[PDB]
Amino acid sequence: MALEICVKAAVGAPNILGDSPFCQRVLLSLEEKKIPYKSHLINLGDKPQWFLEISPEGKVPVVKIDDKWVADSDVIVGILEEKNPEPPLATPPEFASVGSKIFPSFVKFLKSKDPNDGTEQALLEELKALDGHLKVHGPFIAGEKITAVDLSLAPKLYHLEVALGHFKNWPIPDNLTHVLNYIKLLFSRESFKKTRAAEEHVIAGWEPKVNA
Numbered sequence: 075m076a077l078e079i080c081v082k083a084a085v086g087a088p089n090i091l092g093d094s095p096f097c098q099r100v101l102l103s104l105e106e107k108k109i110p111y112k113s114h115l116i117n118l119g120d121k122p123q124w125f126l127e128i129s130p131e132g133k134v135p136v137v138k139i140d141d142k143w144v145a146d147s148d149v150i151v152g153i154l155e156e157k158n159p160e161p162p163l164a165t166p167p168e169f170a171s172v173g174s175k176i177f178p179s180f181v182k183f184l185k186s187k188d189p190n191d192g193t194e195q196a197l198l199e200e201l202k203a204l205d206g207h208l209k210v211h212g213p214f215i216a217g218e219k220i221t222a223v224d225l226s227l228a229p230k231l232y233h234l235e236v237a238l239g240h241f242k243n244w245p246i247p248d249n250l251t252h253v254l255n256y257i258k259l260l261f262s263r264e265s266f267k268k269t270r271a272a273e274e275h276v277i278a279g280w281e282p283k284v285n286a
């Protein structure tokens with residue numbers, strides 16, 4: 075009963091948000107609404123089937139909406155907004171077009187067996203195509219307010235800053251004048267500052283996920 079968020083924690087530490095920007099989203103879309111919840115944090119499987127059977131895949135991250143189950147962190151950006159009593163945040167702007175290319179390409183940046191040095195030459199132009207229109211709107215990666223593109227990307231940018239920072243601390247130039255200031259906003263609000271992981275426990279959970 076109530077919002078029972080059932081989520082992968084850090085590797086080794088079932089009390090902190092670690093290597094999953096995917097679970098950090100679920101906190102973000104409810105903290106933007108200010109709606110209260112509880113976070114059942116799982117280290118890899120250390121909580122039994124009652125915390126996993128909420129997923130149609132058996133995979134965390136997933137949610138109960140007062141025991142009424144909902145599937146994974148990438149369809150939660152619709153289904154946790156659809157079933158909410160507080161205002162839905164699922165609304166896709168024009169920024170969802172470029173943001174849907176950034177969404178997997180920044181996961182592949184953290185799995186760059188295929189070179190990141192060649193990948194980054196597309197990521198700078200993906201960031202420019204987003205940033206060139208975001209600098210007209212001002213504050214958030216979905217435009218004037220937080221909606222689905224911030225829900226797709228916001229903790230994944232902080233996970234890139236932390237986990238890519240461990241081996242290739244890739245700078246955002248001031249020409250990306252929304253992106254470079256929006257990363258500073260992730261250290262603020264309820265919707266981003268509460269979803270911040272402990273940073274060693276992002277890196278030590280991301281290492282085997284360069285492979286897996």
Ligand SMILES: O=C1O[C@H]([C@@H](O)CO)C(=O)C1=O
Pocket residue numbers: 093094095096180181182184185230233279280283284286
């Ligand atoms: O979004 C992210 O990228 C990495 C890996 O998944 C890359 O495959 C990480 O661990 C986190 O979940």
